């Protein structure tokens, strides 16, 4: 199928409580595989998947050097951004960065991205064409000009189209069992009486992968969102996902409602009814 | 593999 490799960085200043906390996480699709936490003791880029453990020691030295330097540029960015917005040195602020590349089913480069957030809001981002920038405010315009002068877009492009996809393909092969699987959802329906007349029909999807799923309810085979509850897809803790949809129903009428389950691991969409 | 290049805001 199509796949992606993504890195997420979060840097939080704590004025007068230590150097800023810095957390980096690496993902292939929905599966985490590396980790760095500046408050952890190891001070290393640690593995978080089994298939990444078969990298050599020189890989872990190199990722650790690159991630420790990431942390320091973010420590600097925090200072710069405080300046840019005329903020005090008492407030705790947040720098977020996300970058990655997507490959299609032939595993060839398809799309690249590099975005920054400051304080929960968009700051600057590479445009889909990987040649321009989208600066959010006036402050971000300053960074746009710094990076256009240094040709930063061009340089990111050579990582996104180069090392990024080429290492995404190596990870996809090393982890073929984990990463190329589709786990079809294990579905079932439950019935919980609320009153002596009203009932809850809950439609469950469990142990699936990837996380992309659709749950919808129908009444007499007609789409119904009224009186329904959807919870956000949640991680099971073992690398699969869960989700449920629920509809409150007048008792006696349960048999009119059908839950429908779409997931790419299913040859055909499931239909579930109360029985 | 993380990118080597470091940029500054």
């Amino acid at each position, epitope marked *: 199928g199509s796949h992606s490799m993504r890195y997420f960085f979060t840097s939080v200043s704590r004025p007068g409580r230590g150097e800023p906390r810095f957390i980096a996480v690496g993902y292939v699709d929905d599966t985490q595989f590396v980790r760095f936490d500046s408050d952890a003791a190891s001070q290393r880029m640690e593995p978080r998947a089994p298939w990444i453990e078969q990298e050599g020691p020189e890989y872990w030295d190199g990722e650790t050097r690159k991630v420790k*330097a990431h942390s*320091q540029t973010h420590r600097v960015d925090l200072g710069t951004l405080r300046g840019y917005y005329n903020q005090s040195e008492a407030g705790s602020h947040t720098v977020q960065r996300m970058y990655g590349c997507d490959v299609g089913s032939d595993w060839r480069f398809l799309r690249g991205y590099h975005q920054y957030a400051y304080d929960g809001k968009d700051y600057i981002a590479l445009k889909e064409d990987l040649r321009s920038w989208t600066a959010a405010d006036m402050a971000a315009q300053t960074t746009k000009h*710094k990076w256009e002068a*240094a040709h930063v877009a061009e340089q990111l492009r050579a990582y996104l189209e180069g090392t990024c996809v080429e290492w995404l393909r190596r990870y996809l092969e090393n982890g073929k069992e984990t990463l190329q699987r589709t786990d079809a959802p294990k579905t079932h329906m439950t019935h919980h009486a609320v009153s002596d007349h009203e009932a809850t029909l809950r439609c469950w999807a469990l142990s699936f992968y990837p996380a992309e799923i659709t749950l919808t309810w129908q009444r007499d085979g007609e789409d119904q969102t009224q009186d329904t509850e959807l919870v956000e897809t949640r991680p099971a803790g073992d690398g699969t996902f869960q989700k449920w949809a629920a509809v409150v129903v007048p008792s006696g009428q349960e048999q009119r409602y059908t839950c429908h389950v779409q997931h790419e691991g299913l040859p055909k969409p499931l239909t579930l009814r109360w029985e | 593999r993380l990118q*080597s*290049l470091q*940029i500054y805001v």
Partner: T-cell receptor
Amino acid sequence: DAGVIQSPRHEVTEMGQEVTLRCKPISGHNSLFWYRQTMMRGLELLIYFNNNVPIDDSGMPEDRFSAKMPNASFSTLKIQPSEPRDSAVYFCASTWGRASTDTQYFGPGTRLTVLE
Amino acid sequence: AQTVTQSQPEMSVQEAETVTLSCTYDTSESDYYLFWYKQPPSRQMILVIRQEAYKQQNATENRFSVNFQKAAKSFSLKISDSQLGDAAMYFCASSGNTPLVFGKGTRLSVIP
């Protein structure tokens, strides 16, 4: 001069003494690098700063070497105590600080000889 | 993970003839820059020529050109119509995990 300034051109000290080399970056540059050149090891990166924050101090000798960048206009690299093995040419370079690929502009160096 | 190799420490060229200075390198990524630096006996480092690894065209600066062969990880420096002033140490260099890493350097002598 509007280049990298390095005080002083040469310096002879006796071992055991203190040694403090100073460097001023090109104005507007926000990133400063220290190197040392030897005939044995070549050019070795020592430490560098961006915005006066120490970004990497891998190559610093583990015990006798210290560096500060108190503000954007100057940086000191300090040796205490000096030992003959510290004799080298100590180069300072600056860059705009926008990216690690920015072109580095080098000072004339301070060649230090530490005599017994 | 980041090395620069200059195999010949001493090269000679006859004045006005051309000379090629060899350089190979190992790099772990695809976002790197390559550089040639000159150091005259004055010890001042001067940038001769810069190659961005994403650019395909070989970089040329007057009589200085490079043979950038990415797949071979080779980056030799061609000095044509060489001059007495070209006598110096030349250093191949790269930007990667570290912002500048220098090879061991080649001392070029220009026989007048």
